[PDB]
Amino acid sequence: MTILIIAGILGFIMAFSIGANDVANSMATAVGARAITVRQAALIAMFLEFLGAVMFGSHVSQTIVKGIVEVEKVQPVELMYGALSALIAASFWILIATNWGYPVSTTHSIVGGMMGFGLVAVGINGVNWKTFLFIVLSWVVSPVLGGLISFVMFKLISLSVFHTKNPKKSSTVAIPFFISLAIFTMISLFVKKTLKQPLSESFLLGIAFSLVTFFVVHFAVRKLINEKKDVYDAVENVFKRAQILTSCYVSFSHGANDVANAAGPVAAVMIVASTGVVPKTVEIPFLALLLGGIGISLGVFFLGQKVMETVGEKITTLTNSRGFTVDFSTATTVLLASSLGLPISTTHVVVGAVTGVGFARGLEMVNVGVLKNIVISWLLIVPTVAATSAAVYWVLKLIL
Amino acid sequence: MTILIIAGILGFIMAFSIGANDVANSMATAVGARAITVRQAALIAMFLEFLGAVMFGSHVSQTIVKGIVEVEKVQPVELMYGALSALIAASFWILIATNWGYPVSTTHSIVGGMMGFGLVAVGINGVNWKTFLFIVLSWVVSPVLGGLISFVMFKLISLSVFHTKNPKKSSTVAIPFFISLAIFTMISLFVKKTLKQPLSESFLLGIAFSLVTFFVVHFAVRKLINEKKDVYDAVENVFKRAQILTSCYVSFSHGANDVANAAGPVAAVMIVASTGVVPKTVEIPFLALLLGGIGISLGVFFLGQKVMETVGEKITTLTNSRGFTVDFSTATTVLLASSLGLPISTTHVVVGAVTGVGFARGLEMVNVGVLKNIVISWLLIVPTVAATSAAVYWVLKLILK
Ligand code: NA
Ligand code: NA
Ligand code: NA
Ligand code: NA
Ligand code: NA
Ligand code: NA
């Protein structure tokens, strides 16, 4: 069908713009500390974004489909064209911002696109205001939770690793611990929410994976910590390797939360085209997640990695231990949001995480100018994309 | 729950012995080409063995639970003591062989253990001969299939890489193709058999993972192929790095097929303690698979770091393209066997794959006294473990009563 080809193209363009605008949220810690080149960061992210999208991305895709527009108050064909309009408008504005090196929330963009459609097609009652209010609350709370976690974690690492009688030995315990906790979070959430297994099985699998991870990472760190004789340099060299893993953690969580910004709308179009109805129980077709994940990966490789040769527009000049802490806090916050089905901004979460570290260490950094740009974009994106989606939808109803 | 504790200890020891004896089967190619150190090989295998055990290990575990002993002819309590007897006996012989550095089949060992228990408890009727027959058939067919796949694949490599106008450019396409095929196989089987999703969805996910894998590996190879000027040196350098991936593939498939050799007996004990009669359809308790996976990983790390760098010395003349091919063919054979629920020997499959790509092999060297020892141990392991398991079971039955 022409509608399915158009929806495939527009969903691919949305996903590509997500990958382009958001790679920095994952890879700027590792690239800024020169733990990896821009090209290695792009290849790794290509894999980890796709993996997060597949293992965990349907939960938020449900919310995007049903949690913004009151879909029952809309005709199926209307929902189809509203999804496409939202994709058109979000994609346009994201690609514009990426052109100018500007960071935007692709989540805020697609949600404003959906809101624009719903307001034009039905009016004020075309919007699911209760769910939308919870989403806006999460938009404000998640950056603060990220800052809070990064604050507490930076302090804990300073106390238990650096300002300690034997930093090397301490680091061989602390860095495995955080890698294992990341693995436990991913595995237990995947087994409970995606595989539908009971809570006890999910926990047991998470513990088992975290035990294997701790063992292996401990012995690798033990090898690495004796490559340098200077203590601080040895610790930082180990954090340098480990913050690649924690970048992968962020890129996974990003795919998990954000594939919805392309797959939710695409899934809405696919379901309406295939059935002619809007079913009460939304199931996200796997083609939608795969299209979105591959699109994000390709955007990472072909337009991202140039965004990042300019500079990591969202986290750069910290030590390896600080990048490690920023990544961990960001990924944990985003994965927990995804487990609740909340579409949040990974951009604003990483900004919150680095602000938290700055409050912990010394307020020089954060760069207040980019912080101001983030706040301006934050305030403008939802109204702008909403108005654009409303106009695109309006025009589109020139259909006989 | 004393019986549960004893089962945990014995299953752990068996799993440890598997990891110790078999890490060579996946990592000796990579270690012998010096693509990685023994220590690195051990850490990688630790993660990949556990991952295969957890993602794909339940299917062969079901066959170990009811494909050797005729479960409906043994009282459940006796099945529980027989499972323990088999674990004790197999572990003992695996550890003896490992201590001398000899690669043996832990699958042949545990099946012999179970057969021995079944024969002493019930006689000729205590053995599930219909299924045991297909298992022995697979023990004969699997190494041959590994050799054949090996041979055909090395021919494919020659045709598509070496016998071409621009072998660097060709390797840039052929190595990503095989890495992608490996990923397609792992994913499609995991989604189909473990997660029990429809065939079309399994294939669709396998293909998407393949596409991403091909893209990423293609650009990594494009980079690597530029490090050496000479065509053949550059291609072998790329195979040298890619055969690390293919060693991971073998490790995963090894965990998938062999966690059963410890998890099947443990599961049988858990099922009897929990419900009594072994039900129509067996569900392997994840605890069994997790214990088996952890024990294999720990055996790889604490003991396998000896027999690995004893198989590896014998194949340091194996080209990187051949080690790549041997691993791919071994892992494919073993994964497909696992998807059929067949408990297979990965040792014999590796040997088959090696003979299929060509053997320098130093042979005569190996020391022919050692080669004779290896052949003897392989022909004798099933009856030796069966007899040891029978003895342990009867001794046990007494000491109890
Ligand atoms: Na990082
Ligand atoms: Na962004
Ligand atoms: Na999001
Ligand atoms: Na062996
Ligand atoms: Na190898
Ligand atoms: Na086996």
Which residues in chain A are contacts of B212 at CB distance < 8 A?
46-47, 50, 293-294, 297
CA pseudo-torsion sign A88, A90, A91, A95: positive
B204 touches chain A (CB under 8 A): yes
What's the CA gap between A382 and A108, in Å, rounded?
6
Phi and psi, residue B204, nearest 5°:
-65, -40
**Cβ A325 vs Cβ A82: under 8 Å:** no
Query: Among B204, B211, B287, whose Cβ lies nearest the Cβ of A286?
Result: B204
Angle between helices A167-189 and A231-258 in degrees, nearest 10: 10
What's the CA gap between B35 and B240, in Å, rounded?
6
Which tokens in the block code for residue A272?
């309406």
> Are the beta carbons of B297 and A195 separated by less than 8 Å?
no
Which residues in chain B are contacts of A49 at CB distance < 8 A?
none
How many inter-chain contacts (A to B, CB under 8 Å) are there? Answer: 66
DSSP B101: T
Return the C-alpha torsion angle B230, B235, B241, B247, nearest 10: -150
What's the CA gap between B353 and B149, in Å, rounded?
7
Chain B residue with minimum CA distance to A49:
B212
**Cβ B206 vs Cβ B273: under 8 Å:** no
Question: What is the enclosing helix (H) or strand (E) of A105?
Answer: none
> Are the beta carbons of A54 and B201 separated by less than 8 Å?
no
Q: Name residue A267's amino acid.
A: A
CA of residue B298 relative to chain centroid, distance:
16
Q: Name residue B17's amino acid.
A: S
Q: How far is B298 from chain A (nearest CA, A)?
A: 9
Closest by Cα among B193, B289, B90, B99 to A212: B289
Query: Among A195, A208, A216, whose Cβ lies nearest the Cβ of B43?
Result: A216
A297 touches chain B (CB under 8 A): yes
Q: How far is A350 from chain B (nearest CA, A)?
A: 26
**Cβ B213 vs Cβ B183: under 8 Å:** yes
What's the CA gap between A118 and A139, in Å, rounded?
20
CA of residue A197 relative to chain centroid, distance:
25
**Cβ A393 vs Cβ A120: under 8 Å:** yes
Phi and psi, residue B69, nearest 5°:
-85, 140
With tokens 């088999």, the residue in question is B86
Closest by Cα among A344, A397, A399 to A22: A344
Which residues in chain A are contacts of B43 at CB distance < 8 A?
216, 219-220
Return the number of other C-beta atoms located less than 10 Å from residue A296's C-beta.
37
What's the CA gap between A290 and A301, in Å, rounded?
17
Q: How far is B135 from chain A (nearest CA, A)?
A: 31
The residue among B48, B58, B214, B216 with the most chain A CBs within 10 A of its CB, best to mutate, is B216
**Cβ B256 vs Cβ B334: under 8 Å:** yes
Residue A5 CB contacts under 8 Å (≥ 6 apart), including other chains: none
Length of chain A: 400
**Cβ A72 vs Cβ A65: under 8 Å:** no
> Are the beta carbons of B208 and A46 separated by less than 8 Å?
no
DSSP B161: I
CA of residue A390 relative to chain centroid, distance:
26
- Distance from the CA of A104 to the center of ligand 2, in angstroms? 4
Farthest-apart Cα atoms in chain B, separation = 76
Phi and psi, residue B164, nearest 5°:
-130, 165
What's the CA gap between A373 and A379, in Å, rounded?
10
**Cβ A193 vs Cβ A140: under 8 Å:** no
What's the CA gap between A153 and B122, in Å, rounded?
62
> Are the beta carbons of B47 and A287 separated by less than 8 Å?
no
Which tokens in the block code for residue B268?
């049988």
Chain B residue with minimum CA distance to A45:
B216
Closest by Cα among B49, B126, B133 to B82: B126
What's the CA gap between A84 and A392, in Å, rounded?
9
**Cβ B344 vs Cβ B138: under 8 Å:** yes
Give A127's strand partners: A69
Domain carrying residue A303: 2-396
Which CA distances in Å does B151 have to B55, B345, B364?
A: 29, 19, 21
What's the CA gap between B333 and B26, in Å, rounded?
13
Phi and psi, residue A127, nearest 5°:
-120, 135
B201 touches chain A (CB under 8 A): yes
- Distance from the CA of A270 to the center of ligand 5, in angstroms? 43
> Are the beta carbons of B294 and A211 separated by less than 8 Å?
yes
Nearest-ligand number for the alpha carbon of B182: 5
Burial annotation B108-147 (CB, 10 A radius, 16+ → b, else e): bbbbbbbbbbbbbbbeeebbbeebbeebeebbeebbebbb
Which CA distances in Å does B265 have to A87, B4, B118?
A: 55, 12, 13
- CB neighbour class for B198 (10 Å; exposed up to 12, middle 13-18, buried from 19): exposed
B46 touches chain A (CB under 8 A): yes
Closest by Cα among B247, B253, B243, B249 to B175: B243
Helix spans in chain A (H): 2-32, 38-56, 58-66, 76-99, 106-122, 129-157, 167-189, 199-224, 231-258, 260-275, 286-302, 307-310, 320-339, 346-361, 368-396
What's the CA gap between B291 and A388, in Å, rounded?
56
Number of domains composing chain B: 1
Angle between helices A2-32 and A38-56 in degrees, nearest 10: 130
CA pseudo-torsion sign A95, A98, A102, A107: positive
**Cβ B329 vs Cβ B146: under 8 Å:** yes
What's the CA gap between A368 and A373, in Å, rounded?
9
Question: What is the enclosing helix (H) or strand (E) of B357?
Answer: helix B346-357
Return the number of other C-beta atoms located less than 10 Å from residue A373's C-beta.
16
Chain A residue with minimum CA distance to B301:
A216
Which tokens in the block code for residue A135?
């989403």
> Are the beta carbons of A201 and B294 separated by less than 8 Å?
no
Omega into B241 within 30° of 0, i.e. cis? no
The technique by which this structure was obtained is: X-ray
Which residues in chain B are contacts of A209 at CB distance < 8 A?
50, 54
> Are the beta carbons of A208 and B46 separated by less than 8 Å?
no
DSSP A277: S
**Cβ A73 vs Cβ A345: under 8 Å:** no
What's the CA gap between B60 and B55, in Å, rounded?
12
Closest by Cα among B139, B241, B249, B259 to B185: B249
B48 touches chain A (CB under 8 A): no
Phi and psi, residue B48, nearest 5°:
-75, -40
DSSP B127: B
> Are the beta carbons of A211 and B43 separated by less than 8 Å?
no
Which residues in chain B are contacts of A208 at CB distance < 8 A?
50, 54, 290, 293-294
Ordered DSSP codes for A173-235: HHHHHHHHHHHHHHHHHIIIIIS---HHHHHHHHHHHHHHHHHHHHHHHHHHTTS-SSHHHHH
> Are the beta carbons of A301 and B208 separated by less than 8 Å?
no
**Cβ B257 vs Cβ B60: under 8 Å:** yes
Which tokens in the block code for residue A326?
């920023």
What's the CA gap between A107 and A257, in Å, rounded?
9
DSSP B57: T
Which residues in chain A are contacts of B47 at CB distance < 8 A?
212-213, 216
Nearest-ligand number for the alpha carbon of A17: 2
Ordered DSSP codes for A111-156: HHHHHHHHHHHH-GGGB-HHHHHHHHHHHHHHHHHHHHHHHHHHHH
Three-state secondary-structure class, residue A361: helix
Which residues in chain B are contacts of A39 at CB distance < 8 A?
219, 223
What's the CA gap between A137 and A133, in Å, rounded?
6
Which CA distances in Å does A400 have to A80, A322, A327, A396, A397?
A: 16, 58, 51, 10, 8
Q: How far is B47 from chain A (nearest CA, A)?
A: 7
What's the CA gap between B194 and B35, in Å, rounded?
33
What's the CA gap between B340 and B319, in Å, rounded?
32
Residue A185 CB contacts under 8 Å (≥ 6 apart), including other chains: A206, A332, A335, A336
A302 touches chain B (CB under 8 A): no
Query: Among A212, A290, A294, whose Cβ lies nearest the Cβ of B50?
Result: A212
